[PDB]
Swiss-Prot record, chain B:
Annotated [4Fe-4S] cluster binding sites: 559, 568
Free-text comment on the cofactor: P700 is a chlorophyll a/chlorophyll a' dimer, A0 is one or more chlorophyll a, A1 is one or both phylloquinones and FX is a shared 4Fe-4S iron-sulfur center.
Localisation per UniProt entry: Plastid, Chloroplast thylakoid membrane
Source organism: Chlamydomonas reinhardtii (Chlamydomonas smithii)
Annotated positions binding phylloquinone: 671
NCBIfam families: psaB
Protein name according to UniProt: Photosystem I P700 chlorophyll a apoprotein A2
Annotated membrane topology: Multi-pass membrane protein
GO cellular component terms, A-Z: chloroplast thylakoid membrane; photosystem I
UniProtKB/Swiss-Prot annotation, chain C:
GO cellular component, as recorded: chloroplast thylakoid membrane; photosystem I
Keyword check for Heme: no
Name the record gives this protein: Photosystem I reaction center subunit V, chloroplastic
Any Gene Ontology biological process: photosynthesis
Protein keywords: Chloroplast, Membrane, Photosynthesis, Photosystem I, Plastid, Thylakoid, Transit peptide, Transmembrane, Transmembrane helix
Coarse class of the protein's main subcellular location: plastid
Cited function: Not yet known.
Positions of transmembrane segments: 5-25, 66-86
Domain of life of the source: Eukaryota
Family: Belongs to the PsaG/PsaK family.
Cellular localisation: Plastid, Chloroplast thylakoid membrane
Membrane topology reported for the UniProt record: Multi-pass membrane protein
Residues of the full protein shown: 32 to 122 of 126
Native organism: Chlamydomonas reinhardtii
Swiss-Prot record, chain F:
TM stretches of this protein: 5-23
Compartments where located: Plastid, Chloroplast thylakoid membrane
Lineage: superkingdom: Eukaryota
Region (Disordered): 25-50
Protein name (Swiss-Prot/TrEMBL): Photosystem I reaction center subunit VI, chloroplastic
Stated role: Possible role could be the docking of the LHC I antenna complex to the core complex.
Protein family: Belongs to the psaH family.
Swiss-Prot record, chain G:
Reaction catalysis annotation: reduced [plastocyanin] + hnu + oxidized [2Fe-2S]-[ferredoxin] = oxidized [plastocyanin] + reduced [2Fe-2S]-[ferredoxin]
Protein name per Swiss-Prot or TrEMBL: Photosystem I iron-sulfur center
Gene name tied to this protein: psaC
GO BP, sorted A to Z: photosynthesis; photosynthetic electron transport in photosystem I
One MF annotation (Gene Ontology) recorded for this entry: electron transfer activity
Pfam families xref list: Fer4_7
Keyword Transferase attached: no
Source organism: Chlamydomonas reinhardtii
Chain residues that bind [4Fe-4S] cluster 1: 10, 13, 16, 57
Cofactor stoichiometry and binding remark: Binds 2 [4Fe-4S] clusters. Cluster 2 is most probably the spectroscopically characterized electron acceptor FA and cluster 1 is most probably FB.
Cofactor(s) listed: [4Fe-4S] cluster
Enzyme class: oxidoreductase
Length: 201, 734, 91, 182, 37, 50, 80
């Protein structure tokens, strides 16, 4: 209930019953209670794969190995054609149970046999903790794809290019820079308009 | 069923036909007749709608700036504009073939661009643009302004900022602000832009948003303005050896009064336009303090209307009680507005072909043609709207007891005289004009062309001699060297005007003869006829003798059936409906005439016009037939060239037009029976009786089909003529 | 050719001619109550930006507010600068 | 009290709003709530004007290199393009704090989640001084702007150049000797 | 600082020729036929 | 809503990619272009005008 | 449904009733004319607006009017 801009409203179906509910849905996508049931696991799985991708994207660029946007380009691995067909069967098999175990139980688990908890670890109020970590990680992944972009160096290399350095080389002193200033100025003045929508009711 | 669409009219969203869709599209902007419509709500909706319209206008202009700046070649056009053609925008059509794109790539571009026959390039070159960057800045600015207007339109609907009814209907406070602010201050600021930017850009300089605060517009600067030495702003103006975009023969003056044209660019001087906007800025700002606001000295419009009733009672009550009908009704104000705007539009066209303001206009000829034709047709439609809203005023908003004895009731008292005399002049012009044309045709067809009537238009030639055209040997008032007017104006503003009026190469006061006599009478026939139809429709809207309670039906009702001999097309709507055809015809005559006279001017042989303009075969053979040679050769079994798109549009127009005849000639019930048999067929067909209509199919109603037929007629007419004009003029000179 | 003499004398002349002789004839047109005294019978905002709010007090024996001064001085300035401007084009 | 020598005060002066002089010749301050918004706007425009006049006069007395108008484009370390969004962000937070307090509870100003008054005094003898200095500062800053535009001087150059010669160096001079100063 | 990319007509033309008409006509058609409760 | 969302997803992901990978000659426009200076100087018939 | 109104200049000559192809008009007793009858329109929900009643009325400007209005499935004459 700390809203996404300090003094805000709550859209009329984002009450405090969801986990990460900071009351942000301006385009009215999830107006159903049937797509919320689905967008929640879209949120969790889209975030979850990215959480598992950030570790790899950092280690491959800390240890050595060639940069990720050209990872599979050159490949000492085996038979580019058919190992994707290996990457179809096991996955579709696994998807059968992911969607099936999504259907038969309520909106939480996925693995083949049960809601997967071989430990006695947290199945508690801290699912908001990992969906929070996930929605941090998704934003972290786009940044790396924008580093395979404009600068062309990896994460940790540009981390050295600016992050021991002053604010002389950052967004606004770079190729895609005049648009970000406009978007910052526009997004910042936007809750000042949303307040004007609901001040005059 | 009781469907949602549309919510403004409950009786309309009730029937199970397809009439509800068309009528819901048709009665949306008829705010006065929705469900639960008060008067305050009406004014507020109209206000917000105005904001919507402003948003669309500014967004559109931003679009033009953006496409010109991105896909055009304005940076290269400003170096040599008697050369490389303007570029409107670029094409990406996946339907093209190889020679198509190979053909359209013209004007120095790298892909399929098409030429800009709009005159935006000359406008933006005159006002002071020079590069692309400035155009982009303008586009961003105008898009931002459009967003502001859209937001305001949303704002003033919110229930705390909704203006009350009496904030509207405040005449005296709206005219002071419009006349002073909206006209005067805008004109003064435009003078500011001309003086600061447009002139020094025409001297050779880049006065931008950078360093306009540190550049003297005149090398003395606000000393003579505060001393009273104003004629020191006019000393040493731009030499007649001027080159526009450089500093060659550059003067120093900022406010002159020369007249004439620029000797190298064939436009008006910029200094004259600065001085003009300055002068009328002063006039409008002074005129904005006439009426009364929350202060002392103002006027009341009701007193002014009350006191102007003449003695002896040649008018009954004069203008008593008009102020409570101009203020209380919207269709009256809208009628006046459309009338004024239409006449002003015509004036815009008439002055912009003859006195071209923009640099290197009138050397791009397609620009002249398209601009003048465009504004003429726009003026026609606007004037027709004015009379239509007159008729709606009489039916909906007129009240007799409030208007007992003013001029408005007097006009309803003697309307048969008006309609009779309009009928008379229409008949007179028709008989004699058509007769003289047919007589000249017969004489030309037989071997004797000297046996025909060629009346010399001596009145207009008298006037042209009065303005200074020293060719007709009349010698008076501006053509005589010893006149008072000639000698008084001689020292400062005549010698430009005389050199511009005795040139036989510009459009200023073209030489005229008998063909012009005949065509001007044809034009007068058009105006009197169209006025006849419209005025008859307006004044007979309260009722006729065929039907004395037409006011109980509203504006647009179908008929009254077969009784009393049958009354088809009796509504005022149908009178205007008939008038639209005349508008299209009359503008057709003026535009054919203008176009051919300027084609013969730009080619070189005015003799062809002055000989072949006096008999209708001359028009058919020497204008419609000869000039459509490069058009219809836009594509053939041998190839295609630039004007293939025009040669396809040219047939497109005909197709729409001929479809237009169908809704006019063949009226309804036949189609009703046909559609009913279709309903049977789709109902009993096996394997396709699994899909039904939700709303029953019916034929178009009697009123609607008239509008649809007129839409096709007008659209096909416009597309055909535009195609011919652009293709012919740009094929020859372009 | 002094601008101060032309403008000052102009505004003085027009303020005088508005002070002494054209006062009552301007005050005979204050009576519009025969036709309009309720310009707007309104209650709130959007009606009192249209109705009178303030009355400019005059201890002037005849009653010139600042508005009449502004008007006659404005005409005086217009005419004075017209005189200087017609004088401006080399006589 | 009132601007003219004689006026019957309209329906915005009852006896006190913040500090009042009955000056509404056009008659805007009448809508209820809207006049309150105008009051808060007057106060905050005054606040930025006071900080601005302090800014220019402090820049000039402390001996900075350019004048106040050419101070936007010398050079900095960030230096110019990344200075807009940071401003927008910081002013965003503070400002939406200000408004979102002012709308709900505190119909006076503050800075952060308060009615702001750590170590000061609150009495109308301070409110009227605040509003009066605010008006004085708005008029002052527009004076700086137009004066700088016409004379191309820093303000104390203007004041000392006027004190060296009262009869002369007036607005008539700098408006009728404009090519001398450019 | 503003320039649209070279590939911009190729994408924006069929978008506004085929997609927005499709969404517009489908949405409007659902709106037209709706029954009031 | 499901298949109606699916047709949106596929329609977008087909048309938008048709823009920049429907470069399989599209007959003329897509970076195959005018390989001859087609009608640059050919503009007018009496006056050339480029 | 359309709007059918009978006015007082009626002389009660029964022409409108015999011309109506839908039986929405009927003659009621009245004490205002020589024939002691007057037409009436008790069933204007069946009217389609063909305006034969207007054609059959003898008295000048008519004693019966048919004002057109909001159509329905019966006032359009649709048989399907
Ligand atoms: C909001 C208050 C504010 C005020 C009163 C000014 C005042 C000014 N700034 Mg400025 N700035 C302001 C905000 C900011 N400026 C700057 C950064 C700059 C720069 C780099 C420059 C200015 C310049 C200017 C001048 C523009 C005059 C002109 O040519 O107008 C007409 C032009 C437009 C309206 C555009 C003017 C003295 C220019 C200058 O110093 O020239 C003498 C200049 O080069 N400012 C930033 C950081 C991005 C600001 C953010 O708050
Ligand atoms: C893409 C994965 C994804 C999905 C499916 C969701 C789904 C959801 N989020 Mg969510 N979220 C995400 C990522 C995602 N989130 C990320 C990355 C952030 C951090 C930036 C957030 C931050 C966030 C907040 C703060 C809140 C939600 C909420 C919600 C729920 C209700 C709102 C709704 O209807 O959303 C439906 C949304 C979709 C179906 C996504 C559609 C994707 C669009 C069409 C394309 C987006 C592309 C983007 C504009 C371009 C790239 C952006 C980049 C440049 C920054 C819903 C379950 C609200 C809630 O109930 O609390 C949990 C809420 O308050 N989210
Ligand atoms: C879950 C997401 C994910 C994905 C899709 C990949 C994908 C890839 N990784 Mg990788 N990686 C990940 C997570 C991921 N990694 C994590 C979390 C770590 C940290 C432990 C690493 C550490 C890592 C290293 C150190 C290397 C790769 C390499 C590779 C590439 C070769 C794959 C292969 O056959 O190696 C074998 C992979 C498996 C057998 C995976 C089975 C489980 C491939 C592009 C290799 C590469 O790029 O070589 C050129 C390589 O050297 N990754
Ligand atoms: C100074 C203050 C001011 C100003 C600037 C305006 C301005 C405007 N008011 Mg407005 N208004 C004011 C005070 C003011 N009003 C007051 C005090 C009241 C209360 C009484 C109102 C009440 C009011 C109402 C009720 C409405 C407006 C509307 C409008 C808009 C008219 C539409 C338009 O764009 O016309 C533009 C007109 C011109 C630019 C002048 C045209 C002059 C000639 C005909 C054109 C030819 C000149 C030249 C050749 C053109 C060059 C062409 C170029 C391309 C080359 C306009 C924005 C209307 C509107 O749109 O609402 C949104 C409306 O409905 N106002
Ligand atoms: C200042 C501009 C203006 C304004 C504000 C109005 C406002 C109004 N007019 Mg009006 N009018 C105007 C100009 C204006 N008119 C002009 C210039 C004409 C002359 C043509 C008319 C003729 C006119 C008539 C004859 C009538 C009105 C009516 C009305 C009222 C209802 C409008 C309505 O429901 O239409 C709804 C609008 C539509 C359904 C749009 C129809 C689309 C038209 C046919 C154009 C289609 C052409 C097409 C786009 C071409 C495409 C080409 C293709 C190849 C792409 C409304 C008060 C009506 C009224 O008061 O009813 C009693 C009425 O009967 N007006
Ligand atoms: C809110 C008003 C305001 C604004 C917008 C600015 C803005 C600016 N001041 Mg400034 N200043 C202000 C009030 C303001 N000041 C006040 C009240 C004082 C007196 C204490 C000063 C004293 C001052 C000095 C002494 C200097 C600036 C400088 C600057 C410029 C660079 C920022 C910097 O490093 O400042 C320094 C940090 C602070 C002022 C804090 C920047 C344009 C610097 C500059 O480049 O001069 C043009 C500079 O040398 N200002
Ligand atoms: C000299 C002008 C002046 C005066 C008289 C006041 C007076 C007041 N302000 Mg205020 N204020 C000012 C300038 C001023 N302010 C400026 C410039 C800003 C912008 C930063 C603010 C921002 C501000 C806020 C945000 C708030 C106030 C509040 C108040 C009231 C209670 C605070 C107090 O004890 O004030 C005491 C004031 C003084 C003792 C005078 C200050 C003297 C300084 C220290 C000299 C500085 C020299 C300079 C740096 C060089 C009080 C009426 C509060 C209020 O109204 O709540 C009801 C409140 O919330 N003020
Ligand atoms: C309103 C004026 C206007 C008009 C008529 C056009 C016309 C055109 N533009 Mg365009 N454009 C405009 C303004 C305009 N532009 C502006 C202001 C921008 C800057 C954002 C652009 C940016 C732009 C690009 C980047 C491209 C075009 C392209 C095109 C062409 C293909 C149509 C298309 O896909 O457009 C798409 C247009 C847009 C995405 C911009 C429109 C944005 C506004 C907000 C929409 C307006 C809504 C409209 C008024 C409602 C009508 C629909 C309603 C009846 C249901 C066509 C010639 C294409 C082209 O050049 O091909 C050669 C192309 O790739 N435009
Ligand atoms: C129906 C109606 C209406 C409308 C109407 C209209 C539409 C009208 C129009 C009108 C018009 C449209 C008119 C026009 C006019 C014009 C004129 C009237 C002109 C004049 C001119 C002049 C006067 C000139 C003069 C001169 C000369 C000759 C030359 C030299 C200069 C001078 C200036 C001297 C209304 C709304 C009212 C309402 C009622 C109904
Ligand atoms: C105290 C007193 C006195 C005195 C008084 C006085 C003397 C007053 C004055 C007053 C004044 C002295 C006023 C003035 C005013 C002014 C004005 C009001 C002005 C205006 C201006 C204008 C209006 C202008 C305009 C323009 C321009 C800007 C330029 C040119 C053009 C034009 C015209 C547009 C005595 C001793 C008698 C005694 C009693 C008491
Ligand atoms: C053909 C015809 C019909 C039949 C017309 C019908 C059945 C409608 C035909 C339109 C079809 C259904 C769609 C036409 C396609 C258009 C592009 C639709 C445009 C819709 C706008 C909203 C854009 C009549 O009902 C009629 C009535 C009176 C006089 C003349 C005629 C007449 O000529």
């Amino acid at each position: 209930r700390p809203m996404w801009y300090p003094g805000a409203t709550a859209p009329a179906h984002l009450d405090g019953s969801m986990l990460g509910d900071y009351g942000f849905d301006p385009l009215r996508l999830g107006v159903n209670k049937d797509n919320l049931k689905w967008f929640r696991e879209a949120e969790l799985t889209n975030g979850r794969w990215a959480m598992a991708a950030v570790v790899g994207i950092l280690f491959t660029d800390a240890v050595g190995l060639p940069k990720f946007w050209t990872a599979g380009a050159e490949k000492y691995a085996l038979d580019n054609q058919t190992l994707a067909l290996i990457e179809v069967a096991v996955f579709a098999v696994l998807e059968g149970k992911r969607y099936e175990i999504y259907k038969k139980t309520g909106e939480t688990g996925f693995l083949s046999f049960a809601p997967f908890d071989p430990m006695g670890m947290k199945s508690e109020e801290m699912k908001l903790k990992e969906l929070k970590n996930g929605r941090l990680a998704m934003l972290a992944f786009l940044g790396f794809c924008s580093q395979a972009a404009v600068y062309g160096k990896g994460p940790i290399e540009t981390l050295q290019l600016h992050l021991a350095d002053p604010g002389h080389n950052n967004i606004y002193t770079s190729s895609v820079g005049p648009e970000t200033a406009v978007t910052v100025a526009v997004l910042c003045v936007l809750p000042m308009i949303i307040e004007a929508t609901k001040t005059l009711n | 069923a009781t469907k949602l669409f549309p919510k403004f009219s409950q009786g309309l969203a009730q029937d199970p036909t397809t009439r509800r869709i068309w009528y819901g599209l048709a009665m949306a902007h008829d705010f006065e007749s929705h469900d639960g419509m008060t008067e305050e709500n009406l004014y507020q909706k109209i206000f917000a709608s105005h904001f919507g319209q402003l948003s669309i206008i500014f967004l559109w202009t931003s679009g033009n700036l953006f496409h010109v700046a991105w896909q055009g070649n304005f940076e290269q056009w400003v170096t040599d504009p008697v050369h490389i053609r303007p570029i409107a925008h670029a094409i990406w059509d996946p339907h093209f073939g190889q020679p198509a794109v190979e053909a359209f790539t013209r004007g120095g571009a790298s892909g399929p661009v098409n030429i800009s026959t709009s005159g935006v390039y000359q406008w933006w070159y005159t006002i002071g643009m020079r590069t692309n960057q400035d155009l982009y800045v303008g586009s961003v600015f105008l898009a931002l302004v459009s967003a502001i207007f859209l937001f305001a339109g949303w704002l003033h609907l919110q229930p705390n900022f909704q203006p009350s009814l009496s904030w509207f209907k405040d005449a005296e406070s709206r005219l002071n602000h419009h006349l002073s602010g909206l006209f005067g201050v805008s004109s003064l600021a435009w003078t500011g832009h001309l003086v600061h930017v447009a002139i020094p850009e025409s001297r050779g300089q880049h006065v931008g948003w950078d360093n306009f605060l540190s550049v003297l517009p005149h090398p003395q600067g606000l000393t003579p303005f505060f001393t009273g030495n104003w004629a020191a702003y006019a000393q040493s103006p731009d030499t007649a050896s001027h080159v526009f975009g450089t500093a060659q023969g550059s003067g120093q003056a900022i406010l002159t009064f020369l007249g004439g044209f620029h000797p190298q660019t064939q436009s008006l001087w910029l200094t004259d336009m600065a001085h003009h906007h300055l002068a009328i800025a002063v006039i409008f700002i002074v005129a904005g303090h006439m009426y009364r606001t929350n202060f002392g000295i103002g006027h009341r419009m009701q007193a002014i209307l009350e006191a102007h009733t003449p003695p002896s009672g040649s008018l009954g009550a004069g203008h008593k009680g008009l102020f409570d009908t101009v203020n209380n009704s919207l269709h009256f104000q809208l009628g006046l507005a459309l009338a004024s705007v239409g006449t002003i539009t015509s004036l815009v066209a008439q002055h912009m072909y003859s006195l071209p303001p923009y640099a290197f206009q009138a050397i791009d000829f397609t620009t002249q043609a398209a601009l003048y034709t465009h504004h003429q047709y726009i003026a026609g439609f606007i004037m027709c709207g004015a009379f239509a809203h007159g008729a709606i005023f009489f039916i909906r908003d007129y009240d007799p007891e409030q208007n007992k004895g003013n001029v408005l009731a007097r006009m309803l008292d003697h309307k048969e005289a008006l309609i009779s005399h309009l009928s008379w002049v229409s008949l007179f012009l028709g008989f004699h004009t058509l007769g003289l044309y047919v007589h000249n045709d017969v004489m030309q067809a037989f071997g004797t062309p000297e046996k025909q009537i060629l009346i010399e238009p001596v009145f207009a030639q008298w006037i042209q001699a009065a303005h200074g055209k020293a060719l007709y040997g009349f010698d008076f008032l501006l053509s005589s060297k010893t006149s008072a007017a000639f000698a008084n104006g001689q020292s400062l503003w005549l010698p430009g005007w005389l050199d511009a009026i005795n040139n036989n190469q510009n459009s200023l006061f073209l030489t005229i003869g008998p063909g012009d006599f005949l065509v001007h009478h044809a034009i007068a026939l058009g105006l009197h006829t169209t006025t006849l139809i419209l005025v008859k429709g307006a004044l007979d809207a309260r009722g006729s003798k065929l039907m004395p309670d037409k006011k109980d039906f509203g504006y647009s009702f179908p008929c009254d059936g077969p009784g009393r001999g049958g009354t088809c097309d009796i509504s005022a709507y149908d009178a205007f409906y008939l008038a639209v055809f005349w508008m299209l015809n009359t503008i057709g005559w003026v535009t054919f005439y203008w176009h051919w006279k300027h084609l013969t001017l730009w080619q070189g042989n005015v003799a062809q016009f002055d000989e072949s303009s006096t008999y209708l075969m001359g028009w058919l053979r020497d204008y419609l037939w000869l000039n459509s040679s490069q058009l219809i050769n836009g594509y053939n079994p041998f190839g295609m060239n630039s004007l293939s798109v025009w040669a396809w549009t040219f047939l497109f127009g005909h197709l729409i037009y001929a479809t237009g005849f169908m809704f006019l000639i063949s009226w309804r019930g036949y189609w009703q029976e046909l559609i009913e048999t279709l309903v049977w067929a789709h109902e009993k067909t096996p394997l396709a009786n699994l899909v039904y209509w939700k709303d029953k199919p019916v034929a178009l109603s009697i009123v609607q089909a008239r509008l649809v037929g007129l839409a096709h007629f007008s659209v096909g007419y416009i597309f055909t003529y535009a195609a011919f004009l652009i293709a012919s003029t740009s094929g020859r000179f372009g | 050719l002094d601008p101060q003499i032309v403008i000052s004398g102009s505004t003085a002349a027009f303020l005088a001619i508005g002070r002494f002789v054209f006062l009552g004839y301007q005050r005979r047109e204050a009576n519009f109550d025969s036709t309009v005294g309720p310009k707007t019978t309104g209650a709130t905002y959007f009606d009192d930006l249209q109705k009178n709010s303030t009355i400019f007090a005059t201890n002037d024996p005849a009653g010139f507010n600042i508005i009449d001064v502004a008007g006659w001085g404005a005409l005086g300035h217009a005419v004075g600068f017209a005189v200087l401007a017609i004088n401006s084009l080399q006589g | 009290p009132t601007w003219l020598p004689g006026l019957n005060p309209p329906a915005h002066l009852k006896g006190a709003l913040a500090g009042d002089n009955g000056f509404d010749p056009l008659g805007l301050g009448q809508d209820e709530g809207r006049l309150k918004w105008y009051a808060e706007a007057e106060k905050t425009n005054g606040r930025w004007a006071m900080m601005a006049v302090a800014g220019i006069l402090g820049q000039e007395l402390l001996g900075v290199t350019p004048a106040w108008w050419e101070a936007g484009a010398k050079e900095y370390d960030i230096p110019a393009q990344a200075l807009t969004p940071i401003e927008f962000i910081v002013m965003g937070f503070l400002e939406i704090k200000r408004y979102q307090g002012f709308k709900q509870t505190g119909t006076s100003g503050f800075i952060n989640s308060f009615p702001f008054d750590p170590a000061g005094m609150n009495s109308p003898s301070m409110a009227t001084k605040e509003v009066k200095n605010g008006r004085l500062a708005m008029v002052a800053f527009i004076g700086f702007c137009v004066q700088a535009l016409a004379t191309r001087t820093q303000p104390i150059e203007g004041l000392t150049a006027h004190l060296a010669d009262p009869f002369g160096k007036n607005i008539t001079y700098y408006l009728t000797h404009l090519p001398e100063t450019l | 600082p503003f320039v649209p990319p070279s590939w911009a007509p190729s994408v924006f033309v069929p978008l506004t020729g085929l997609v927005l008409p499709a969404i517009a006509m489908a949405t409007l058609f659902v709106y037209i036929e709706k029954e009031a409760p | 809503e499901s298949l109606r969302a699916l047709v949106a997803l596929s329609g977008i992901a087909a048309i938008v990619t048709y823009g920049l990978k429907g470069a399989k000659d599209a007959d003329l426009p897509i970076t195959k272009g005018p390989q001859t200076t087609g009608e640059n100087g050919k503009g007018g018939s009496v006056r050339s005008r480029l | 449904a359309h709007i059918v109104k009978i006015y007082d200049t009626c002389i009660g000559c029964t022409q409108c009733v015999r011309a109506c192809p839908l039986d929405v008009l009927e003659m009621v007793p009245w004490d205002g004319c020589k024939a002691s009858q007057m037409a009436s329109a008790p069933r204007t929900e069946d009217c389609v607006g063909c305006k034969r009643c207007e054609t059959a009325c003898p008295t000048d400007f008519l004693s019966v009017r048919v004002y057109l209005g909001s159509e329905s499935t019966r006032s359009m004459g649709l048989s399907y």
